[PDB]
């Protein structure tokens, strides 16, 4: 009903969930969501400061395909730099 705030509590993981690893020193979930959209649909994106990011997709088919056709890519930042990242299932 009423709106909420944004947090990463320890919840379940359906068969539609992934993690992203090797993030640059200065990325965000915004560039994550806008990037990771090459593997189906990415209705959730979150990150930390850096090193990793944590993500949820729509379905297992897309999630599985992410590990096949959306890993070893480069990731863009707000900082003029771009790291490589390696996806995995959660």
Swiss-Prot record:
Phosphorylated by CLK1, CLK2, CLK3 and CLK4. Phosphorylated by SRPK1 at multiple serines in its RS domain via a directional (C-terminal to N-terminal) and a dual-track mechanism incorporating both processive phosphorylation (in which the kinase stays attached to the substrate after each round of phosphorylation) and distributive phosphorylation steps (in which the kinase and substrate dissociate after each phosphorylation event). Plays a role in preventing exon skipping, ensuring the accuracy of splicing and regulating alternative splicing. Interacts with other spliceosomal components, via the RS domains, to form a bridge between the 5'- and 3'-splice site binding components, U1 snRNP and U2AF. Can stimulate binding of U1 snRNP to a 5'-splice site-containing pre-mRNA. Binds to purine-rich RNA sequences, either the octamer, 5'-RGAAGAAC-3' (r=A or G) or the decamers, AGGACAGAGC/AGGACGAAGC. Binds preferentially to the 5'-CGAGGCG-3' motif in vitro. Belongs to the splicing factor SR family. Residues 1-29 are annotated as: Disordered. Residues 16-90 form the RRM domain. This is Serine/arginine-rich splicing factor 1. Changing residue 57 to A: In AV; loss of ability to activate splicing. Great reduction in splice site switching activity and no effect on RNA-binding. It is linked to Neurodevelopmental disorder with dysmorphic facies and behavioral abnormalities: An autosomal dominant disorder characterized by developmental delay, intellectual disability, speech delay, hypotonia, behavioral abnormalities, and non-specific dysmorphic facial features. Some patients have variable skeletal and cardiac anomalies. The modification Omega-N-methylarginine is found at residues 4, 6. It comes from Homo sapiens (Human). Transmembrane segments: none annotated. The modification Phosphoserine is found at residue 28. It is found in: Cytoplasm; Nucleus speckle. The modification Asymmetric dimethylarginine is found at residue 4. The RRM 2 domain plays an important role in governing both the binding mode and the phosphorylation mechanism of the RS domain by SRPK1. RS domain and RRM 2 are uniquely positioned to initiate a highly directional (C-terminus to N-terminus) phosphorylation reaction in which the RS domain slides through an extended electronegative channel separating the docking groove of SRPK1 and the active site. RRM 2 binds toward the periphery of the active site and guides the directional phosphorylation mechanism. Both the RS domain and an RRM domain are required for nucleocytoplasmic shuttling. It comes from the Eukaryota. Consists of two polypeptides of p32 and p33. Identified in the spliceosome C complex. Component of a ribonucleoprotein complex containing mRNAs and RNA-binding proteins including DDX5, HNRNPH2 and SRSF1 as well as splicing regulator ARVCF. In vitro, self-associates and binds SRSF2, SNRNP70 and U2AF1 but not U2AF2. Binds SREK1/SFRS12. Interacts with SAFB/SAFB1. Interacts with PSIP1/LEDGF. Interacts with RSRC1 (via Arg/Ser-rich domain). Interacts with ZRSR2/U2AF1-RS2. Interacts with CCDC55 (via C-terminus). The gene is SRSF1. The modification N6-acetyllysine is found at residue 74.
